[PDB]
Structures are given as C-alpha cells and as structure tokens.
Amino acid sequence: MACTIQKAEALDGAHLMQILWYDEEESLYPAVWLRDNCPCSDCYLDSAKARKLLVEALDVNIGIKGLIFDRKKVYITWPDEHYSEFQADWLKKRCFSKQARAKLQRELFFPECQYWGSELQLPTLDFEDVLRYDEHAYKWLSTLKKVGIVRLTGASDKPGEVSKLGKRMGFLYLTFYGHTWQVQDKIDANNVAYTTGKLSFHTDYPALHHPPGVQLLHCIKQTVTGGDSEIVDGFNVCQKLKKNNPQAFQILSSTFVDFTDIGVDYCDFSVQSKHKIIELDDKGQVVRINFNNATRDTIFDVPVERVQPFYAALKEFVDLMNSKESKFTFKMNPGDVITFDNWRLLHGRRSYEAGTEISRHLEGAYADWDVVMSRLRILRQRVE
Amino acid sequence: MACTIQKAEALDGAHLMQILWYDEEESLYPAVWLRDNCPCSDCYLDSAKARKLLVEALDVNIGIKGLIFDRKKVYITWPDEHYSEFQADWLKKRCFSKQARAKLQRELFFPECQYWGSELQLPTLDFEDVLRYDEHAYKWLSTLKKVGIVRLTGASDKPGEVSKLGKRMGFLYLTFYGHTWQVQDKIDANNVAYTTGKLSFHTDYPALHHPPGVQLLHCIKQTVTGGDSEIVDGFNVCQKLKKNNPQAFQILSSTFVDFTDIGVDYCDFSVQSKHKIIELDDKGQVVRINFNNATRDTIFDVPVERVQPFYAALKEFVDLMNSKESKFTFKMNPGDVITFDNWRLLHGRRSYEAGTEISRHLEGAYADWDVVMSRLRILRQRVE
Numbered sequence: 055m056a057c058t059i060q061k062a063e064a065l066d067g068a069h070l071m072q073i074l075w076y077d078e079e080e081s082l083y084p085a086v087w088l089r090d091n092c093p094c095s096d097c098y099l100d101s102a103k104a105r106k107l108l109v110e111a112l113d114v115n116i117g118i119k120g121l122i123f124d125r126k127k128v129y130i131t132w133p134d135e136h137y138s139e140f141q142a143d144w145l146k147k148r149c150f151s152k153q154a155r156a157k158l159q160r161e162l163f164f165p166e167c168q169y170w171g172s173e174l175q176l177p178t179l180d181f182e183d184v185l186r187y188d189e190h191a192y193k194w195l196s197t198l199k200k201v202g203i204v205r206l207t208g209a210s211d212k213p214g215e216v217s218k219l220g221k222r223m224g225f226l227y228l229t230f231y232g233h234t235w236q237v238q239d240k241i242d243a244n245n246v247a248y249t250t251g252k253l254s255f256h257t258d259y260p261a262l263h264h265p266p267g268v269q270l271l272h273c274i275k276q277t278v279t280g281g282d283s284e285i286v287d288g289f290n291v292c293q294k295l296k297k298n299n300p301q302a303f304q305i306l307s308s309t310f311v312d313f314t315d316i317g318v319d320y321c322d323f324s325v326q327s328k329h330k331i332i333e334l335d336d337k338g339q340v341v342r343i344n345f346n347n348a349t350r351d352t353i354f355d356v357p358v359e360r361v362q363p364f365y366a367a368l369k370e371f372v373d374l375m376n377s378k379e380s381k382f383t384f385k386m387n388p389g390d391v392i393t394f395d396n397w398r399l400l401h402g403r404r405s406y407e408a409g410t411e412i413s414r415h416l417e418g419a420y421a422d423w424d425v426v427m428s429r430l431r432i433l434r435q436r437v438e
Numbered sequence: 439m440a441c442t443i444q445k446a447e448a449l450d451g452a453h454l455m456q457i458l459w460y461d462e463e464e465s466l467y468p469a470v471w472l473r474d475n476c477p478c479s480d481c482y483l484d485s486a487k488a489r490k491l492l493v494e495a496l497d498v499n500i501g502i503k504g505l506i507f508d509r510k511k512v513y514i515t516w517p518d519e520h521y522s523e524f525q526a527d528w529l530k531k532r533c534f535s536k537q538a539r540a541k542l543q544r545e546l547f548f549p550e551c552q553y554w555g556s557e558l559q560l561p562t563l564d565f566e567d568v569l570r571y572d573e574h575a576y577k578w579l580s581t582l583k584k585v586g587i588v589r590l591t592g593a594s595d596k597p598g599e600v601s602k603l604g605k606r607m608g609f610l611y612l613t614f615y616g617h618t619w620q621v622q623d624k625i626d627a628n629n630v631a632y633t634t635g636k637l638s639f640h641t642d643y644p645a646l647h648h649p650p651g652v653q654l655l656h657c658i659k660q661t662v663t664g665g666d667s668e669i670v671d672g673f674n675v676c677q678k679l680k681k682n683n684p685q686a687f688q689i690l691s692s693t694f695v696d697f698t699d700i701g702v703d704y705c706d707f708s709v710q711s712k713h714k715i716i717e718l719d720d721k722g723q724v725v726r727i728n729f730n731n732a733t734r735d736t737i738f739d740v741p742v743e744r745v746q747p748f749y750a751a752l753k754e755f756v757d758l759m760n761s762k763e764s765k766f767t768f769k770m771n772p773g774d775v776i777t778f779d780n781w782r783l784l785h786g787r788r789s790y791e792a793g794t795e796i797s798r799h800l801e802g803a804y805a806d807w808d809v810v811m812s813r814l815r816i817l818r819q820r821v822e
C-alpha cells in the first residue's frame with residue numbers, strides 16, 4: 055500500500071507533483087527537482103550512477119506539461135518536449151517529509167550513539183574473524199561508529215596486523231609519521247609519544263586541519279612497569295561540561311587554538327593548524343574534539359585578556375576527563391588491537407620505565423571516517 | 439632596540455609580566471602562559487619541539503614569585519620553586535598585541551590572495567626547474583597559494599610526472615580512484631570525467647567530507663576535436679554573488695547538499711557526504727567551495743518549500759561562473775601540468791569526440807593543503 059501509487063497529479067501551477075499512495079499518505083515533489091533528477095540516458099549516466107544534466111540545462115521555473123501514471127511509475131512530459139519516467143519506490147524513498155528524510159539520513163550516516171563513562175564494557179571481537187567474515191567486520195565497524203571503540207583480540211605479536219585491518223577497511227590514511235608507525239621509546243624522539251612518559255588525554259594529530267578519524271593501535275610488546283591505557287568519551291564529557299560550566303564550554307567551543315609539529319619522519323615537515331578544542335556543527339552539536347597538549351603551540355593567537363580564562367576552561371575540561379565517573383582504564387596485551395574514533399574519544403597512557411632493550415612496542419595507523427563509513431555501508435548491504 | 443629588554447616586571451597581583459623594550463614599546467605576558475610554556479627539560483622535549491608539561495600540572499591562578507632580567511633573557515621563579523628562563527626574541531615574536539599576532543599568523547599561513555577573472559595571466563614555470571631548484575619550487579607553491587593555480591610546462595608525455603611532483607611536495611592524497619588516475623574515455627565509465635562529455639564548472643570530490651585541497655592534472659595526449667580547459671576563481675565569484683544577490687548567497691552558504699559516489703575503482707566504494715556549496719568560516723569568509731553537479735545526490739535533505747529557491751540560487755551562481763568576465767579558458771598540450779587549489783577554483787572541460795583509439799589522456803592526482811603548506815614553510819626557510 056505504502057509504495058503503490060493511487061493517484062499522481064501536477065499541482066500549484068504545475069510546479070509540484072503530488073502522489074497519493076495506497077495507504078492514503080501524500081507526498082509532494084517539486085517539478086524542478088524531478089526535472090533535475092530525470093533518470094534517462096541523456097540526463098543520467100547509469101554506469102557511474104551520476105548526473106550528466108548541467109545546471110545550465112535546468113529551467114528553475116519549470117512546470118510539468120503532462121503526466122500519466124500507473125501503480126508503479128509516473129510518466130512526465132516537459133514543456134520543451136523532454137520526457138521522464140520515475141519509479142514509485144525511488145520516489146517513496148526520497149519523499150520530502152521530515153520523517154522520510156530523517157529515516158533516510160539515519161540509513162546513510164549511522165548516527166546512533168551510545169555515550170559511556172567508567173562503566174564501559176569494552177566491545178571485543180576476534181581479529182581473524184573480522185578479517186574473514188563479513189558478519190564480524192560489520193559488527194566491528196558498526197560498534198566502532200556507535201560506541202567509539204572496539205578491541206580485537208588474537209592478532210599476532212608481529213608488525214603488519216594494522217595493515218591487514220587497513221585493507222579490510224579499504225586503505226589507511228598516510229601522514230608524516232608513515233603509513234604505519236612504531237610507538238616505542240626512541241633516542242632523540244621526534245614526538246612525546248615515542249618516549250616512556252605519561253600521555254595525558256589527547257586526540258591524535260590536531261596539528262592537521264583534518265585529523266585522523268579512526269585510529270588503530272596493535273600491542274606487539276607490553277611492559278609490566280606501567281603503560282596502561284586510558285580512554286574517555288569526549289562527547290559525554292562535553293555534555294557534562296556544558297551542564298556544569300557553560301562559560302568554560304563556550305570558551306572551549308569558540309576559541310581557536312594553534313597546534314604545531316616540526317621534525318622529520320616519513321618526510322620532513324613543518325605543520326601548523328588552528329582548531330577550536332570543542333568543535334560544534336551548525337546546530338550546536340559536538341562533532342569533534344581537537345586536543346593534544348603536547349602539540350598545542352607556544353604561539354597563542356588571542357588577546358591578552360582571553361588567555362587566563364582559556365586556561366581555566368581547559369583545566370575544568372581536563373579535570374572532568376580525569377574524573378573516576380568518566381575514564382576507563384585497561385591494559386593492552388600482545389595480540390590485542392584497539393580501534394577507535396579519534397574525533398570523539400580522548401586516549402592516554404601511563405608512564406613506564408626506560409631500559410636498554412625495547413620493553414614496549416605498539417604499531418599504529420590511521421583511517422579516514424569516510425573510508426570506514428563506505429566499508430560499513432557496503433558491509434550492511436552484504437550481510438542484510 | 440625592539441627585541442632588547444629595557445625593563446621586565448611582574449604586575450597585576452603578579453599575574454602578568456610586562457616587558458618594556460628598548461624602543462619604548464611594551465608587551466604583556468600572562469603568568470599562566472609563561473608557566474605553560476616553560477622551555478626547561480622538565481616541561482619541554484627539545485628533540486620533539488613539544489610540550490611535556492600536563493594541564494594537570496598547571497595552576498591557572500599562578501603568579502610570578504620572582505623575576506630578574508638582562509637585555510636578552512628573563513629568569514623567573516614560581517611559587518612551587520619551579521624555575522624558568524625565557525629569551526627576548528622568543529617573547530617578542532609571541533607578543534599578544536593584535537599587530538604582533540597578525541604578523542605571525544601571516545608568516546605561518548600565507549593568507550595573501552589575488553582574485554582574478556578572465557584577465558588572468560596564467561602563472562607558468564618549467565617542470566624540471568621546479569623539481570631541481572628550491573627557488574623555483576618555492577615560487578610554484580607560493581603562487582599556487584596566492585593565485586590558486588600554476589601551470590608547469592616541459593614535463594614528459596608519459597605517465598609518472600604527477601608522482602614526481604607528489605614527492606617534491608611530500609606525498610599525494612590517496613582516494614578510491616587510486617594514487618593517481620587516468621582521465622580518458624572508458625567503457626562502462628564509473629565517473630562522468632571518464633567520458634568525452636562536457637564537464638561544467640565543478641570542484642573535485644565533494645563526496646568526501648575533506649575534499650582534496652590541491653589537484654594536479656598532466657596532459658599526456660590531447661585531441662583537436664575539443665577538450666579545452668576552463669577555470670574560474672570561486673572566491674571571486676562568491677564575492678560577486680553576495681553583492682549581486684545576497685539571498686542566493688545566503689541559501690548557498692546555509693543549505694546542506696548531499697553528495698554521493700558508488701562504484702569500484704582502486705577499491706569498492708559507497709561514499710556519502712553533506713556540504714554547504716559555499717562554505718564560510720566563523721567570520722563569514724568563504725573558505726571552500728564544494729560543488730560537483732555530477733555527484734550531487736538525488737537525495738536532497740531539505741523541506742519541500744526550500745527546494746525550488748535552492749535551485750534558483752544555484753543557477754544564479756553557475757551563471758556568474760560562466761560569465762565572460764569570470765572565466766578563463768585555455769587548452770592543455772602534452773607535457774603541460776596544471777596544479778590548482780581545488781577548494782577555491784572551479785574547473786571544467788569542453789566536450790570532445792569519441793573514437794576507436796584514445797585521443798585524449800590526462801594523468802591526475804591530489805594533495806592535502808597541509809602537506810603543501812608544510813613544504814611551502816620549509817622551502818621559504820631554505821630559500822631565505
């Protein structure tokens with residue numbers, strides 16, 4: 055009933071088509087949008103699933119010249135004699151009602167989000183199962199999107215495991231630190247990560263204007279002397295901050311902070327960026343956290359009177375992240391891989407002891423959320 | 439005189455340091471920022487040029503306990519007995535005055551912009567000179583940033599030339615269409631680009647949330663039957679649109695448009711994004727154009743009443759781009775490479791004739807603006 059056409063007619067100076075569906079619901083489609091979306095071979099390249107029609111070809115004041123229909127299709131003539139056919143199901147999916155549009159957006163972008171604190175049950179799957187089975191790889195990526203982290207257990211204790219996951223996704227995101235990179239204590243370290251020091255909560259790579267969306271970290275060697283992992287749900291923390299201290303939230307979501315990274319690794323680099331630490335979308339919703347205290351520049355591009363209040367806000371934010379209700383701590387063992395949303399979570403590590411041999415070694419890499427989401431869309435379709 | 443210290447003192451409850459320079463100018467530095475930016479080996483990892491100090495270690499209400507100075511350095515004791523030394527030049531550069539901050543930002547981000555229309559003199563350099571000489575590679579990247587395009591002449595007529603430029607920059611930006619890609623007419627084309635059809639003005643890859651910043655296109659084979667290139671300065675066009683039709687500008691800078699790309703190339707993909715066609719920063723300035731009419735989805739996530747006005751605005755924008763005062767047309771010959779700002783310019787191509795052999799072939803690739811800007815910073819330093 056819902057996608058079967060009972061009546062189709064041109065209305066409002068013929069600038070709209072109305073469909074009455076067999077469940078008595080009505081849908082409205084502007085003529086200009088129909089013309090723009092003609093699926094004929096002149097207008098639309100089927101092999102590419104892409105529009106050939108130019109904006110220049112589109113009369114924005116167009117009206118429908120004629121229309122006939124049956125239960126499954128509408129057939130339209132245009133004023134310049136162009137002819138179009140539209141399928142009922144295709145029309146129904148693209149209905150302009152708020153409910154229909156929102157449903158479709160949920161299907162495209164997987165917005166469901168489960169916020170968490172110290173009660174987190176770390177989602178865990180088997181590494182080889184994820185590589186082998188679409189059902190498991192679907193569970194991996196959909197959980198990564200919804201919860202912001204998944205642990206994979208049973209990988210090897212050798213390099214090359216994150217690269218396998220990269221291929222399973224599609225491809226990894228190359229940066230100045232390489233295609234993959236080795237977290238271990240290094241002489242003349244070019245990054246605080248490559249020491250035995252504590253890493254407080256941070257996101258990776260705010261020195262880029264487009265920080266990595268997803269991070270992969272594979273434990274190859276672990277030390278008994280420290281090196282525990284800690285994570286927090288940045289979106290959950292930002293919610294608490296807005297409630298508890300709206301001025302601090304306002305400062306952190308409005309102040310551009312400069313980040314920097316200069317050195318040599320995969321290539322020689324001199325990188326500079328500006329970000330708001332709490333990055334909001336046009337509707338006021340937090341979409342990314344951009345914060346690494348190590349790479350925050352000494353350069354701070356604000357008037358003198360805004361400085362101390364910024365630090366005071368930052369301190370409140372960090373104190374909230376460190377709260378026993380917010381953080382989750384765990385320790386990686388050799389063969390574990392964590393995969394997480396680097397736009398949402400902040401992560402850290404406990405200090406550990408230096409010595410003469412390497413006592414601790416992670417291999418890491420990055421991926422782009424668009425690459426990950428593409429694989430997720432494909433997997434859903436394959437498993438359903 | 440300007441970077442020599444005449445007096446340094448703690449002021450305002452010791453929460454500020456004031457420097458009187460020998461030119462009688464004064465600079466103010468908040469105590470909290472000084473403490474945060476202590477360069478000692480406890481606070482700062484010199485090998486990484488990065489901050490070790492944690493936010494947790496920072497007293498946001500800190501004041502200076504004691505201060506002495508000479509002409510070139512300040513020496514500070516803190517309330518908890520921590521001790522810091524700051525160099526005059528380092529302080530002077532980071533002065534919080536609006537003039538000093540703006541000067542420094544210009545140095546980091548190369549904001550100078552030369553808008554253009556049909557009068558454009560296409561900046562042109564030799565390909566091999568750019569690969570060989572830093573002076574020439576500096577001119578290439580600084581012109582690319584300022585004007586939005588540079589032609590390089592004298593490349594080979596063989597694949598692999600854009601890859602050389604990629605290495606000269608640092609690395610290319612991998613996408614689903616490959617590390618590099620071949621623009622030619624293809625059977626069962628997965629993209630309108632890979633046909634002989636006309637491409638109206640577009641930016642590449644708005645189906646990604648982070649479209650490529652810089653595009654490289656190398657002419658390997660060119661046809662006499664068409665295939666001319668066209669470009670327009672999107673920032674210039676957006677300025678004209680705001681002046682001529684503020685409602686159209688408001689619509690295009692506020693409406694989220696869905697983009698899509700589904701197919702198989704380097705990998706199998708199903709990509710979806712949303713962008714505002716005219717993307718403004720927090721100050722109202724245009725920072726990116728996101729528009730490809732081929733990959734604009736049939737899905738359009740707006741209420742029905744906003745549809746026709748959107749198309750009417752889009753048409754006005756396109757008509758402005760097509761204006762004889764706005765566009766610049768030229769034709770690539772084998773051995774030419776164009777490199778351009780894909781966030782600012784829109785580009786297109788004239789249709790040409792299909793036949794049995796390949797009559798036209800470009801090799802293209804992408805790079806990230808942060809990668810390009812890093813190389814530009816490095817080059818400036820090397821050449822100066």
Ligand SMILES: O=C(O)CNC(=O)C(=O)O
Pocket residue numbers: 237247248253258281282283401402403416
């Ligand atoms: O070493 C760890 O456990 C965590 N490492 C990082 O967060 C990093 O390198 O950015």
Ligand SMILES: O=C(O)CNC(=O)C(=O)O
Pocket residue numbers: 621631632637642665666667785786787800
């Ligand atoms: O073929 C040309 O001249 C231009 N090509 C493109 O703009 C493209 O492939 O996106």
Ligand SMILES: NCCCCCCN
Pocket residue numbers: 122129137
């Ligand atoms: N079932 C209606 C088919 C209409 C075809 C018209 C072709 N111009």
Ligand SMILES: NCCCCCCN
Pocket residue numbers: 506513521
């Ligand atoms: N020139 C002044 C040097 C001060 C050194 C103090 C060390 N604690």
Ligand SMILES: [Zn+2]
Pocket residue numbers: 057058142143
């Ligand atoms: Zn149906």
Ligand SMILES: [Zn+2]
Pocket residue numbers: 092093094095096097098136137138
């Ligand atoms: Zn058509």
Ligand SMILES: [Zn+2]
Pocket residue numbers: 247256257258401
């Ligand atoms: Zn990290």
Ligand SMILES: [Zn+2]
Pocket residue numbers: 320321322605608
């Ligand atoms: Zn290199």
Ligand SMILES: [Zn+2]
Pocket residue numbers: 441442526527
């Ligand atoms: Zn000096």
Ligand SMILES: [Zn+2]
Pocket residue numbers: 476477478479480481482520521522
């Ligand atoms: Zn110190």
Ligand SMILES: [Zn+2]
Pocket residue numbers: 631640641642785
């Ligand atoms: Zn293009």
Ligand SMILES: [Zn+2]
Pocket residue numbers: 221224704705706
């Ligand atoms: Zn693949």
